A and B are shown apart, each in its own frame.
Chain A
Amino acid sequence: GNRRIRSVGEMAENQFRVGLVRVERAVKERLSLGDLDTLMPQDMINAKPI
């Protein structure tokens, strides 16, 4: 009752969030320059980290 079991899905989601926090920091530091009519919501996201 005090020991919890975690499956593959839970750790996969945890690793996804660990990568997403890095991607979020990246998109935040890149959003410091982005203005209107300058970019589509595709170039600010890289596939590398996650």
Chain B
Amino acid sequence: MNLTELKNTPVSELITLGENMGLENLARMRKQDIIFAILKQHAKSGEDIFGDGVLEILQDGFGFLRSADSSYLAGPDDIYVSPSQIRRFNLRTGDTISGKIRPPKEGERYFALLKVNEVNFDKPENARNKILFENLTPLHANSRLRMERGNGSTEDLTARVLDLASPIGRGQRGLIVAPPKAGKTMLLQNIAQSIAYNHPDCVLMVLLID
């Protein structure tokens, strides 16, 4: 099985999947506990697991592959990897890794990676030959990120006005100065929708903090 297909489904799907697996009443546990139990039941039939997680390292040396279900926190679904793999495949924090994983073996309690398959959606060849971030040279934006949708609905105003108020470019350092209860939530909703419609190639990221 793959972990992402347990990721994208809601809780009721996990409930019926566990009922298919002939499991005890599982409505009481966390979603990650249900995923852990289902993966254990699946591997008990002699099966391997496929997982995907963003990598994080502490001073302890070994690494943890977190999922987006808990917004990248510790959990029974995260994968434990030895420092040897980090030393070999040149891993570091933030490097999302997808590949073969196994349930925790005798005495273990978290998953362990077997073979890397996709390092940041890339083969380990060019992943090991990665240019350093701070070693790069910053520039300015010529690629104009068009905020206009072109449909011209009732709310599209808040986007098109930026096309004449604040131009947006790739790599721009932008900051909003606004009082509370003014309309920033729908504003960022609009900007996300507009950039996804006009530029679906760039990976979207939104930070919801506090």
Chain B contacts of A11 at CB under 8 A?
none
Cβ of A5 under 8 Å from chain B? no
Cβ of B74 under 8 Å from chain A? no
**Tally of A interface residues using CB under 8 Å:** 7
Evaluate contact between A43 and B82: CB separation under 8 angstroms.
yes
Chain B contacts of A47 at CB under 8 A?
none
**Tally of B interface residues using CB under 8 Å:** 5
Chain B contacts of A37 at CB under 8 A?
115
CA distance A35 to B82 in the complex (A): 15
Which residues 101-116 in B have Cβ within 8 Å of A in the complex? 105, 114-115
User: Looking at chain B's contact residues, is the secondary structure mostly helix, strand, loop, or mixed?
Assistant: mixed
Evaluate contact between B105 and A33: CB separation under 8 angstroms.
yes
> How does the 8 Å CB contact mask read for B89-126 relative to A, with 1 for contact and 0 for none?
00000000000000001000000001100000000000
**Closest Cβ–Cβ distance, residue B199 to chain A (whole Å):** 38
User: Looking at chain A's contact residues, is the secondary structure mostly helix, strand, loop, or mixed?
Assistant: loop
Cβ of B16 under 8 Å from chain A? no
Chain A contacts of B82 at CB under 8 A?
39, 43
Cβ of B4 under 8 Å from chain A? no
Interface centre among A33, A38, A43 (most CB of B within 10 A): A38
CA distance A36 to B114 in the complex (A): 9
Evaluate contact between A39 and B105: CB separation under 8 angstroms.
no
Evaluate contact between A39 and B115: CB separation under 8 angstroms.
no
Cβ of B84 under 8 Å from chain A? yes
Cβ of A40 under 8 Å from chain B? yes
**Closest Cβ–Cβ distance, residue A2 to chain B (whole Å):** 50
Chain B contacts of A43 at CB under 8 A?
82, 84
Further contacts, 6 of them, CB under 8 A, given A37-B115, A39-B82, A43-B82 = A33-B105, A35-B114, A38-B114, A39-B84, A40-B84, A43-B84
Interface residues, chain B, with chain A CB atoms under 8 Å away = 82, 84, 105, 114-115
Q: What are 9 residue pairs bridging A and B, where the CB atoms are less than 8 Å apart in the complex?
A: A33-B105, A35-B114, A37-B115, A38-B114, A39-B82, A39-B84, A40-B84, A43-B82, A43-B84
Q: Which 6 A-B pairs have CB atoms at the shortest separation, nearest pair first?
A: A40-B84, A37-B115, A39-B84, A38-B114, A33-B105, A43-B82
